[PDB]
Amino acid sequence: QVQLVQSGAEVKKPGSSVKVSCKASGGTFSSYAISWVRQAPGQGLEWMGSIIPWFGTTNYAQKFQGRVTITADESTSTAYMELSSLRSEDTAVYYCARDSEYYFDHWGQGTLVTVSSASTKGPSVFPLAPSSKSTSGGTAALGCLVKDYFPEPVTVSWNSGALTSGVHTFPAVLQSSGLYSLSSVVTVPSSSLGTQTYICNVNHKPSNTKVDKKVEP
């Protein structure tokens, strides 16, 4: 299987530099180029450049020439994208992709880099307990409230990814304070609330927040 695994989300102050990594599965570096593509949140896609891990040769898009450096470490099968002199408009999800020179056929999961001078804050995680007020025809809704964090993103899984059916993880809301909040909910059988364990796994990589919250009736 082909997989490209990128480094975590980061906050960076204006004028600084960010370096995103991209760990490729075996065989990739010996047969393919690696491209970097960015996507401003709520916007479209923009190619930054490519590296051929074989020869170490690079090609950069005109608009990033001088600001971007793409490197490859063949010993670890890891590619890197460094973007210097960061400005507010460099806030985007950065993707690495396997590049045949004719298409991008596999893409990393993406890395959200937020360029901001504001303080990083980890969320509090509160349970949304199942009760008589969250039942409907034999089903029960439960969840987690992930409150007061900056910047994006928070990711939520349930039971370490083993619970996906009926999960809704909502887009973040921006509070008046500049902090974000989000909810993640799941609907389950009401019958088994006494025997099953439900844990929301909340990650906020910019603040090293990693919280596993058990949600009980």
Partner: protein
């Protein structure tokens, strides 16, 4: 250099419908035109390369055609999982992308399932009270939530967001959070989320009495 223009900006269509999306280049790019599918929050996925070559594992209902400047992506039988934004990309010169076409699915009316969550003991101890109202799996997306505290309409103390369309049942869900101080929360009895939606003939109230 080469600019890509996609049409339309969005399409809404029923399951089984034929969907046609077009991509135009500012100059001739031969057949070096790729199509990607992107789900909200996820990485783009290659569907078609070299204008008309179907990527491995991609359903056959996807097809591409064109050469030169005018290109089309066709979904022959739209499925709920086809909800996504679709991007074209030229690779004749330095790669550039179209601005995307959002494809959404039309389906039958579904009323929301409405739930309410009082503040957790953990949060109350910290000095804040967030009350969450959940509207599950409704269609269409237009839904109205009003918060009432002791029958008094609230304003300025709530935030809400809606999900992207569901990839299996084509519905939407909505979460609304009412936030007040612990002190304010304990001055009132009844916390009510009142929901208006096409699938409901009258507003539906979901409420609890504090305690």
């Amino acid at each position: 250099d080469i600019q890509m223009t996609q049409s339309p900006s969005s399409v809404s269509a029923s399951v089984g419908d034929r969907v046609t999306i077009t991509c135009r280049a500012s100059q001739g790019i031969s057949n070096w035109l790729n199509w990607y599918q992107q789900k909200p929050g996820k990485a783009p996925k290659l569907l078609i390369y070299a204008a008309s070559s179907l990527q491995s594992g991609v359903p056959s209902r996807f097809s591409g055609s064109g050469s030169g400047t005018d290109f089309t992506l066709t979904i022959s039988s739209l499925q709920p999982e086809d909800f996504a934004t679709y991007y074209c990309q030229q690779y004749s010169d330095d790669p550039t992308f179209g601005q995307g076409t959002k494809v959404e699915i039309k389906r039958t009316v579904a009323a929301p399932s409405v739930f309410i969550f009082p503040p957790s003991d953990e949060q109350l101890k910290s000095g804040t009270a967030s009350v969450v109202c959940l509207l599950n799996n409704f269609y269409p997306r237009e839904a109205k939530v009003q918060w009432k505290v002791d029958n008094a309409l609230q304003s300025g103390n709530s935030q809400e967001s809606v999900t992207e369309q569901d990839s299996k049942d084509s519905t939407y869900s909505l979460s609304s959070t009412l936030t007040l101080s612990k002190a304010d929360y304990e001055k009132h009895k009844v916390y009510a989320c009142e929901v208006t939606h096409q699938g409901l003939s009258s507003p539906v109230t979901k409420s609890f009495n504090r305690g």
